[PDB]
Amino acid sequence: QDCCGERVVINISGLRFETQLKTLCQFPETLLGDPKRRMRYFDPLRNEYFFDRNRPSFDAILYYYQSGGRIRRPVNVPIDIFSEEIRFYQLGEEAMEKFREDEGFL
Amino acid sequence: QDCCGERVVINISGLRFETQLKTLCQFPETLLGDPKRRMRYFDPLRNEYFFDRNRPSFDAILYYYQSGGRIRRPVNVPIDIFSEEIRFYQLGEEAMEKFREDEGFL
Amino acid sequence: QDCCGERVVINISGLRFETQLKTLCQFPETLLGDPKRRMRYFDPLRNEYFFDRNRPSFDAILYYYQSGGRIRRPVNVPIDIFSEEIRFYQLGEEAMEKFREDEGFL
Amino acid sequence: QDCCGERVVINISGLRFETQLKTLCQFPETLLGDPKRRMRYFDPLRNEYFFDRNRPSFDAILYYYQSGGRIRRPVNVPIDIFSEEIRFYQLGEEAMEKFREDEGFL
Amino acid sequence: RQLQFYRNLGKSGLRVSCLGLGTWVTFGGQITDEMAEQLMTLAYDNGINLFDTAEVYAAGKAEVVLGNIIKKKGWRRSSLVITTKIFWGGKAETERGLSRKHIIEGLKASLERLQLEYVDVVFANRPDPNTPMEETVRAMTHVINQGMAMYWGTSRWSSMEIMEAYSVARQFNLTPPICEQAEYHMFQREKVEVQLPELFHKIGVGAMTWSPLACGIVSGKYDSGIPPYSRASLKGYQWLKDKILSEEGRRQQAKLKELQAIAERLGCTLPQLAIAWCLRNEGVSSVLLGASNADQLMENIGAIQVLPKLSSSIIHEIDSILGNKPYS
Amino acid sequence: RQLQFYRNLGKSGLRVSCLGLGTWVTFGGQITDEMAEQLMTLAYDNGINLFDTAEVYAAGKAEVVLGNIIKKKGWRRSSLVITTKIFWGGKAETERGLSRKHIIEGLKASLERLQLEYVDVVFANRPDPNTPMEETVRAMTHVINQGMAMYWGTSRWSSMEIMEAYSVARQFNLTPPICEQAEYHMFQREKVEVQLPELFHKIGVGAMTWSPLACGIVSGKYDSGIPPYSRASLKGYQWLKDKILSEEGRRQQAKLKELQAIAERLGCTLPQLAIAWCLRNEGVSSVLLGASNADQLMENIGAIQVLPKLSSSIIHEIDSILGNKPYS
Amino acid sequence: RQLQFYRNLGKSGLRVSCLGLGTWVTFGGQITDEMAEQLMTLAYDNGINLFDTAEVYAAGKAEVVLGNIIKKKGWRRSSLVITTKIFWGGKAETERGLSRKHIIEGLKASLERLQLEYVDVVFANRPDPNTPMEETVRAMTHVINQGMAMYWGTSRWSSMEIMEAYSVARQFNLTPPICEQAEYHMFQREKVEVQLPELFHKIGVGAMTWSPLACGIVSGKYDSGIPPYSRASLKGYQWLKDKILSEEGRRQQAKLKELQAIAERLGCTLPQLAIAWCLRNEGVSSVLLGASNADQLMENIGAIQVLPKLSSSIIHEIDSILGNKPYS
Amino acid sequence: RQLQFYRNLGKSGLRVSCLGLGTWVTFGGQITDEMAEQLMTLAYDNGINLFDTAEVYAAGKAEVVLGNIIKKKGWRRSSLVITTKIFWGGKAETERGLSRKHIIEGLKASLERLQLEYVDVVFANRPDPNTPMEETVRAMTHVINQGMAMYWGTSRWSSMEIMEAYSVARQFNLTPPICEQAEYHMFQREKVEVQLPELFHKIGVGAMTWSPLACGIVSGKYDSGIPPYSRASLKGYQWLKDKILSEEGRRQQAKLKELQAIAERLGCTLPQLAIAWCLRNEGVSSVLLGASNADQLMENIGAIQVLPKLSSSIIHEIDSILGNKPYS
Ligand SMILES: NC(=O)c1ccc[n+]([C@@H]2O[C@H](COP(=O)([O-])OP(=O)(O)OC[C@H]3O[C@@H](n4cnc5c(N)ncnc54)[C@H](OP(=O)(O)O)[C@@H]3O)[C@@H](O)[C@H]2O)c1
Ligand SMILES: NC(=O)c1ccc[n+]([C@@H]2O[C@H](COP(=O)([O-])OP(=O)(O)OC[C@H]3O[C@@H](n4cnc5c(N)ncnc54)[C@H](OP(=O)(O)O)[C@@H]3O)[C@@H](O)[C@H]2O)c1
Ligand SMILES: NC(=O)c1ccc[n+]([C@@H]2O[C@H](COP(=O)([O-])OP(=O)(O)OC[C@H]3O[C@@H](n4cnc5c(N)ncnc54)[C@H](OP(=O)(O)O)[C@@H]3O)[C@@H](O)[C@H]2O)c1
Ligand SMILES: NC(=O)c1ccc[n+]([C@@H]2O[C@H](COP(=O)([O-])OP(=O)(O)OC[C@H]3O[C@@H](n4cnc5c(N)ncnc54)[C@H](OP(=O)(O)O)[C@@H]3O)[C@@H](O)[C@H]2O)c1
């Protein structure tokens, strides 16, 4: 389970993101870091994972994996939509605590 | 008329959006939810629907279908342009009333 | 010279825009509305026009053709860069006067 | 070493940028302007350079080459992330000094 | 109007007459070879260029006798349209379905029996649940690109399966189908009238309908009982004889008497009105006929004269008599 | 300058001489086979490598006699450029148009009549309104990929149809056309001069013009009336005889007298000036000639000497005499 | 249940029986041609349609005798599934590997020795480190598109290499593989059980397992020593004889005695239980058998009766006796 | 080390020995057929599998005698690598260049003269300015897909043209080239050493160098003058004789005396050191040799022994003597 080298394409409502597998398998307890949980979104005809979800929220989700654990909400996205995206992608309790600490009232 | 499973590609001036048909047929009285009204925009050579219209306004239109009925104007789009887009895509009277209530003076 | 029906693809530094020819030939005195002036940017291997220029400025340029003549500067673009883009795309003296009137000091 | 004519495709996490080689070889002491330093990011199966990095920061990096040397931070990007991107792409000491002068406290 | 009046099959460039001749029960079975040659000569001399067969008819033997006419009379290949259907090829497990192996082997065996180099259209006779759509579309594109066929189409598919085949062909840069074969007569009206116009307006798939006389029911020969030397009195057609002699058949015969009164008022016969009723809309490109002797074929060709007499009042009167118009 | 001076056909890699020999009315019709062999030998010995025929000329018979020269004299296949045109193939409904079936069958029949394995360019003789553009471009790409042809081009198409064919070929990764055949002489100047340079500069499509002497009008032989053994006195050419003997023909003959005075001042003949006038611009790659005997061909070859004498003053004087320059 | 019960090979449209017959050591070597014809007739009369060979077996000679059965008995080609494996072709440097040249030449030589026009599946026998994956996938797509094969698969590849081949095929619009051949018996359980279900659920690649009796070890014939006329007593099989007569073999024989007690309780024999144990899950499509005489083949066919008797208690008891279940 | 030590040609799967035999001046010209058969037998018995010819050598006649060896001795086709080069095919205008027509016709004529079905690599002998790159890449992909060749490469192209061919092949999903033929000896060092490693590291294009002894100059036979029965004394090689007898040749002979002193210190001969000097880096895959008799070939094969003796000190001493190392 070295999980390295391969390139992964993620399709969010027509918007395409590309990354490496060793970026994703730094956090094995999330939705994208676990092969058992993301296998139901795979598309065999196009070799990609498809999600029918909110488009501007996924850049912060990808930067959470790329930066090593930093959560920063985008300016044009409200609080509850980003909270629902964090709850869907299963980033954990400490990511929610860091998001509450970074956004004032928490 | 189960209207489920198939993937639909919508092309707004070169910007591509992908969704499912059961997302679109939740609201059968709109332009995109009715097969009789959207059939004049179909492109047979590319298997997509093409609209020669405003590009930043369509993300809120897609999130209206994806969120279940919530209208939120983008920050970088003026009032009258978004009102003309709501009038073109035929979202209804109650969507206009919700947009007026969510934007102050209505 | 009916100039109607055909679809035109414009490539700005990797960002692709699609429109119709009757949208472009409403203003025959500009760079994109004249076939003699835009013919030096055509790419025969890809069937598109390529410009090696600023990416966020072209949405307002396309909305000038699509809306019938309205000029609105984007928020994240400075004054002089947008003025240089208006000067490059040859929109005319009255478009510069409308841009000066819409931006305060003119 | 005329370095002119050819088109170069740069892929930043799924976001594609296209430019000319004579735009890139104006600054031969940077990462993108030197063929010896950018050769480890080349993908032979797709004819592009791939970087697994931050997506909204690269528009200012491309406009630094296209405008002739002007540095302007995007609005939705913080200070330290853009400083790390300037340090990665090896723009030089005078670009860092111009970025410090353009951002107040430097 | 229908025969020696040509129209495009769907939106493609292939032009056919709107009457065709079929190669079911009669050919190789009920009738002899000389009667088959007489029927083909009578069809060809009146401007019909469409002939449709399959590999399951009379264990393939009908296809053999079709070749024995075409090589005999010396007709040009460029003036004929020949179609074949492939689903059933034998008793083994690998000799049926819509896999790549059976499509290639069945088309080669059918071209060997027909003494031809290619057919014009090759049809899939029924959908296959055990095969992916991508394999079927790639096999059809492969046999078109090898010169063994020119076009391909479907038969007895639903609208979702045809749309899935179109989407798979557009995804991988392959060849979409052009036509669909469906059943259509006065007592079977749903699929042609409420489902297929959307596919014709959207992706340009035409329709080629079969059994216009409901295996001889709407001809009106069964008003008393079962006459000798008919299809219902043959061995192996007990289902048709049970369908005629049931309780719905008497109501169908009474409605056929009323429609025969209308057709005798118009100056024609009931099979001519039944054939020309199917061609009143532009979604139907051609109608495949079946005949057992030359008098039936010469009567069935004469629906061209009664086609332009169908006004809206006669159509509304027929729809009032039948009472089975589908809601859309 | 034109013959034994070679140039690219459009922007492709095929290099042709700027004089070609045509296979219209004379071949298989007006002249005999020995005269045709003499004309082909005289054309081949002067460096002409371009020969153009079609399947509609003399019911195909002209193509047959073209093959009977090439197999007889034993010329190498690699030193010749042979082109064919396909629209009309017979009296049946499926034997005309630009569908896939007729393109494949007509090219196979033309290759069988020519006793060849392949042609160099295959042309579509006129546009087809009943066929989609995608089917035509896919059929041309298919016959190129099977080794039956090397290139393909159009004839009598407008600019929008050529641009649509290019766009369809670029969309589905297919083969674009390389050349267009258009009519061009001193009284037909619009399409070559105002429409085709944009297509040459944009997508690199060249032009191969036909009828440079307007079926013999600009040669000046009809100054008195209709001489015997001419094209206007043949059976089936009443339209040309009515065109000559109308009221516009007298004004054309007066302008031809003035142009003959200019050509006699230059030291040449009027057909040589008329042929070399068509090659003064770089948008025209080749000019197809027609001849009825060896003296006419030997006179028409001699326009190479009068091509470099055309300065801007003589061109301006010719445009002042003609008075039909199109505005652009 | 396994033989004359057909299932899809992976997710493709090819349907096979779950027992196949192999062409290793016996064919061309240990047994004669009459015994091979008797074994093939006995396999074909019970509903087995899958036969697997390779070009390295008996210097290719086994393939020759396979052809000498198929042309002799006159079986139909459409009722058989024939597979071949290509890695080793000779002693020269260019006669091995998975390059384009050796794939084309080895498939042509194997089709020449088999007296056939095509095979159904062509396998790569082992991975090649000196060749790029794109060249191998393009060569397999080329030999499929020329009609020399219908499908292709891998053998002894890891999961990363199969996923890389799928990704390369999806990148350049090529043909992905459909099947993987792996070793699977009661003492070799890791790769089939923990790695291949992810590939079956993700990209639909099936498994076709080989050596179910561990070259005769799990049959139980080596409980005393090495009997004459066995595989371990042949010339060139010293490795198997050293593997049997080592210290792990005694523990394997004791576990085989306990499993023989279980199989005698169930009313069957130990090879039937060992064969039917491999087919208890849906990830395995077929099992390739080896036999030396007709009694062994008639015993090995009888595992169909003992397949539905395997409940969860007997499987748990077998896993308690064996004690080598892989953790996942 | 070089011969009977095999390596990949570039990054492809084709494996060649690092010594090859060329088919220039000797074959069909200077030497007889029996000497050519003796040279080919001596090359084949030592493990050399690479043989390189062209269609311009001795008006094609050399290719003919190459076929007359291969059919005579009965060698297997799968153990040989045969390459051909195509630019010049005749005196006509359409018989030269890199257009589609000349590539297809020249490859068919070369395969007819060689009595073969296919070659392994087909080279473009020089770049063509009159043809677009897309037409050349599509023609090479077409002749690979028809089974007439396996790979293709370039010769005397610059780096920008090879990169343009790669970019065009990646744009339209076509086949990129794998190899480049360049000139490389001790007095021609720029292109192999400063330009080609970037193309090898970037897109994996290998190099196959020619003329290692500078047409016999670095062998040292011209230390006095022009001996009889040499290449410089033949008819039609006045340029080589003027190059030897000029003022730079004396300095080259003095440097050759110093290099001969070094090679005599190492225990070898000067041509063996000159051949083994070219293979000291990993960017060069193979070296093509030329020989006039069997003693020269047996001497040139012996550079394998002197290849591993080249340390860094001897390379630095040779670079100090030569004094023409390119700056990078
Ligand atoms: N796509 C598919 O799966 C499929 C399936 C089935 C058929 N088809 C096609 O359908 C085509 C039509 O076959 P069909 O026989 O069912 O069409 P049909 O016209 O409805 O059958 C008419 C039958 O009634 C009799 N008949 C014909 N004209 C008559 C007349 N004026 N008066 C009295 N009887 C008359 C004929 O023989 P009798 O007098 O002996 O009854 C004939 O067999 C076939 O050729 C086949 O190619 C396709
Ligand atoms: N793309 C298309 O659809 C199309 C259509 C038509 C033709 N074409 C091509 O056009 C080519 C040219 O045919 P064309 O005959 O129309 O060209 P043309 O050169 O304009 O016709 C000249 C005619 O006048 C006569 N003539 C030739 N030279 C003469 C001379 N010095 N003095 C007096 N009379 C002379 C000849 O016979 P007479 O003396 O008996 O008159 C000849 O038939 C044909 O071969 C055909 O391939 C193409
Ligand atoms: N993908 C690959 O690389 C690969 C590699 C190897 C094999 N294979 C395939 O595997 C297939 C199976 O070959 P296999 O021989 O290894 O399978 P196997 O069934 O495990 O071998 C059984 C051996 O034991 C003997 N035997 C069979 N039934 C017996 C019974 N009831 N009682 C006692 N002895 C019995 C037979 O001869 P003896 O009595 O003389 O021992 C037979 O040779 C081959 O045909 C080949 O196609 C594939
Ligand atoms: N890509 C291209 O365009 C291109 C162009 C040219 C050649 N090539 C290839 O290059 C290959 C090599 O040809 P080449 O002749 O130029 O290579 P070379 O090895 O440099 O030529 C050596 C010449 O000197 C002589 N010689 C060889 N060994 C000798 C020895 N020990 N002592 C004394 N003399 C010796 C031989 O004949 P003599 O004694 O009579 O001189 C031979 O002709 C050709 O086969 C051809 O395929 C390719």
Residues 6+ apart with CB under 8 A from A28: A34
Identify all chain H residues contacting F151, using CB atoms and an 8 Å cutoff. 100
Ramachandran bin of F288, using left for φ above 0, alpha for ψ from -120 to 50, beta for the remaining angles = beta
Cα distances (Å, whole numbers) of residue H65 to D95, G76, H31: 68, 47, 11
Residue E52 DSSP SS3? strand
Put simply, whether C44 touches H (Cβ < 8 Å) is no
Residues of F in contact with C46 (CB under 8 A): 170
E251 class by beta-carbon count within 10 Å (0-12 exposed, 13-18 middle, 19+ buried): exposed
Cα angle at F318 between F312 and F323, to 5 degrees? 120
Angle at H62 between CA H58 and CA H65, to 5 degrees: 145
Phi, psi dihedrals of residue C51, rounded to the nearest 5°: -125, 130
Q: Which residues in F have their CB inside 8 Å of a CB on E?
A: 89-90, 92-95, 97-102, 104-105, 128, 130-132, 135-136, 142, 146, 172-173
Virtual CA dihedral for G66, G72, G77, G79, nearest 10 degrees? -90
- Residue E212 main-chain phi, psi, to 5 deg: -80, -20
The residue type at F163:
M
Binding-site positions of F for NADP(+): 23-24, 30, 52, 125, 155-156, 181, 210-215, 221, 229, 231, 290, 292, 296, 299-300
Contact C44 F198 (CB under 8 A): no
User: Two tokens at F218?
Assistant: 């600009």
Instruction: Give the DSSP H or E segment for B12.
Output: strand B7-12
Task: Give the single-character DSSP code of G96.
Answer: B
Identified catalytic residue from E6, E44, E57, E327: E57
CB H175 within 8 A of CB H169: yes
Q: Which of helix, strand or coil describes residue D16?
A: strand
Whole-number Å distance between alpha carbons of E302 and E267: 12
Alpha-helical segments (H) within E185-305: 190-194, 196-202, 238-244, 248-266, 270-277, 294-301
- What is the E213 CA–ligand 1 centroid distance (Å)? 7
Contacts (Cβ under 8 Å, ≥6 apart) of H209: H181, H182, H183, H184, H192, H278, H284, H286, H287, H288
Residue A104 DSSP class: S
Residue stretches of the annotated binding site of F: 23-24, 30, 52, 125, 155-156, 181, 210-215, 221, 229, 231, 290, 292, 296, 299-300
| Identity at H320, one-letter amino acid code | S
Helix locations, H84-216, DSSP H: 100-114, 133-145, 159-171, 190-194, 196-203
Q: Which helix (H) or strand (E) holds C79?
A: helix C79-89
Name the token pair of C77: 């673009």
Report the residue from B18, B23, B63 with minimal CB separation from A14.
B18
Handedness of CA G51, G53, G58, G59 (dihedral sign): positive
Long-range contact pairs involving F252-257 (C-beta distance under 8 Å, separation at least 24): F252/F187, F252/F217, F253/F222, F253/F223, F255/F321, F255/F322, F256/F217, F256/F218, F256/F220, F256/F223, F257/F223
- Ligand 1 centroid distance, CA of E19 (Å): 13
Domain span at residue F255 reads 1-328
Of H2, H21, H24, which is best to mutate to test ligand 4, by the most ligand atoms within 8 angstroms of its C-beta?
A: H24
Q: Of all helices (H) and strands (E), which one includes residue B18?
A: strand B15-20
How distant, in Å, are the alpha carbons of D96, D99, F94 from that of D70? 11, 9, 67
Instruction: Enumerate the residues of chain G whose CB falls inside 8 A of the CB of residue H173.
Output: 172-173
Determine the residue type at H12: S
CA pair distance G111, G117, nearest whole angstrom = 6
Residues E4 and G90: their CA atoms lie apart, in Å, by 65
Query: Nearest residue CA, atom 36 of ligand 3?
Result: G291
Give the C-alpha separation, H37 to H18, whole Å: 21
Instruction: Give strand pairing partners of H188.
Output: H185
- How far, in Å, from the CA of E95 to the mean position of ligand 1? 27
Instruction: With beta carbons under 8 A apart, name residues in chain A contacting G202.
Output: 39, 42, 44
| Phi, then psi, of C16 in degrees rounded to 5 | -105, 135
B47 and E198 within 8 Å at the Cβ level: the answer is no
Measure the CA–CA gap between E191 and G171, rounded to whole angstroms.
Answer: 39
Beta-carbon-side half-sphere exposure of residue F257 (alpha carbons within 13 Å) = 8
CA–CA gap between residue F44 and residue F50 (Å, rounded): 9
Question: From CA G223, how far away is CA G211, in angstroms rounded?
Answer: 19
Interface test with F, best of H86, H93, H135, H172 (most F CBs within 10 A): H93
Q: CB pairs below 8 Å between E and F: how many?
A: 58
Token pair belonging to F69: 């020269």
Decide if G325 contacts G319 (C-beta within 8 A). Answer: yes
Tally Cβ neighbours within 10 Å of residue E48.
25
For G201, the token pair is 């659920």
Q: How close does chain C come to D58, measured CA to CA in Å? A: 12
User: Is F22 a pocket residue for ligand 2 (Cβ < 6 Å)?
Assistant: yes
Q: Which tokens sit at E169? A: 């062909």
Biggest CA pair distance of chain G: 57
Measured from the alpha carbon of residue F123, the closest ligand is 2
The per-type count for chain C, helices as H runs and strands as E runs, is 4, 4
* Ligand 2 atom index nearest CA of F234: 40
Q: Which residues of G touch H3 (CB under 8 A)?
A: none
Three-state secondary-structure class, residue G139 = helix
Measured CA to CA, the distance from residue E99 to residue A1 in angstroms comes to 37
Contacts of H8 (CB under 8 A, 6+ apart): G130, H14, H15, H206, H285
| Per-residue tokens: F191 | 């399409």
A83: tokens are: 């909270």
Which of G163, G170, G201 is facing A39, going by the closest CB pair? G201
Where b means 16+ CB within 10 Å and e means fewer, H118-151 reads bbbbbbbbebbebbbbbbbbbbbbbbbbeebbbb
For H63-96, b/e burial (b = at least 16 CB within 10 A) is bbbbbebbeeeeeeebebbbbbbbbbbbeebbbb
Q: Is the dihedral of CA G27, G28, G29, G34 positive or negative?
A: positive
- Check if G210 has its Cβ closer than 6 Å to any atom of ligand 3: yes
CA angle, corner A50, sides to A45 and A51, nearest 5? 160
Ligand nearest to C-alpha G24: 3
Query: Which residues in chain D are contacts of H163 at CB distance < 8 A?
Result: 6
Atom 47 in ligand 2: residue holding the nearest Cα: F22
Strands C42-43 and D15-20: unpaired
Cα–Cα dist H164/C46, whole Å: 15
Q: How far is C8 from chain B (nearest CA, A)?
A: 10
Nearest to G252, CA basis, from G319, G183, G187: G187
> How far, in Å, are D19, D47, H218 from residue D7 at the CA level?
6, 11, 44
If you ran DSSP here, which 8-state letter would residue F27 be given? Answer: I
Q: According to the entry, how was the structure determined?
A: cryo-EM
Number of domains in chain E: 1
DSSP codes of every residue in E134-168: HHHHHHHHHHHHTTSEEEEEEES--HHHHHHHHHH
Chain D residues touching chain A at CB-CB below 8 Å: 11, 13-14, 50, 52-56, 75-76, 78
Q: CA-to-CA distance for G120 and G141, rounded, in angstroms?
A: 14
CB of G24 shorter than 6 A to ligand 3: yes
Which residue reads 């969704």 in tokens? B19
The dihedrals phi and psi of F22, each to the nearest 5 degrees, come to -100, 160
Q: Are E54 and E121 a contacting pair, CB within 8 Å?
A: no
Query: CB neighbours of G228 closer than 8 A, spacing ≥ 6?
Result: none
**Residue E181 annotated as binding?**
yes
Name the strand (E) or helix (H) holding E6.
strand E6-8
DSSP G16-67: EESEEEE-STIIIIIS-HHHHHHHHHHHHTTT--EEE--SSGGGGHHHHHHH
Task: Show the ligand 1 pocket: residues with CB < 6 angstroms.
Answer: E 22-24, 52, 125, 155-156, 181, 210-216, 219, 221, 230-231, 271, 288-292, 296, 299-300
Quote the strand ranges of chain H, DSSP E.
6-8, 15-17, 19-22, 50-52, 81-86, 119-124, 149-155, 179-183, 206-210, 284-289
Alpha carbon distance E152, E174 (integer Å):
12
Is the CA virtual torsion B25, B29, B33, B39 positive or negative? positive
Q: Are D62 and C11 a contacting pair at CB < 8 A?
A: no
Residues 6+ apart with CB under 8 A from E28: E57, E58, E61, E62, E64, E65
Q: Is G215 in the pocket of ligand 3 (CB under 6 A)?
A: yes
Distance, in Å, from the CA atom of E28 to the CA atom of E58, rounded to the nearest integer, reads 6
Asked if H260 and H220 touch (Cβ cutoff 8 Å), the reply is: yes
In angstroms, what separates the C-alpha of G134 from chain D's closest C-alpha? 9
> Which chain C residue shows the shortest CA-CA distance from H172?
C45
The response to whether residue F20 sits with its C-beta less than 6 Å from ligand 2 reads: no
Backbone angles phi, psi at F116, to 5 degrees: -125, 165
Cβ of residue D45 closer than 8 Å to a chain G Cβ: yes
Closest ligand (CA of E227): 1
Residue whose C-alpha is closest to residue F8's, from B81, D46, H101: H101
H290 Cβ inside 6 Å of ligand 4: yes
Count CB atoms within 10 A of the CB of residue E10: 23
When CB atoms are compared, the residue of D35, D42, D47 closest to H170 is D47
According to DSSP, residue H96 is labeled: B
- End-to-end alpha-carbon separation of chain G, Å? 28
The half-sphere exposure of F262 on its side-chain side, counting CA atoms within 13 A, is 26
Let me know: does C77 contact D75? Beta carbons within 8 Å. no
